[PDB]
Design a protein around this ligand. Sequence first.
Ligand SMILES: *c1ccc([N+](=O)[O-])c2nonc12
Length: 13
Amino acid sequence: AAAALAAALAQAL
Ligand SMILES: *c1ccc([N+](=O)[O-])c2nonc12
């Protein structure tokens, strides 16, 4: 889950 989210945020920004 950590990675999923990490990646989400990365993309968002
Ligand atoms: C999660 C998984 C892979 C990568 N990546 O840089 O290839 C990520 N970057 O930020 N979160 C992830």
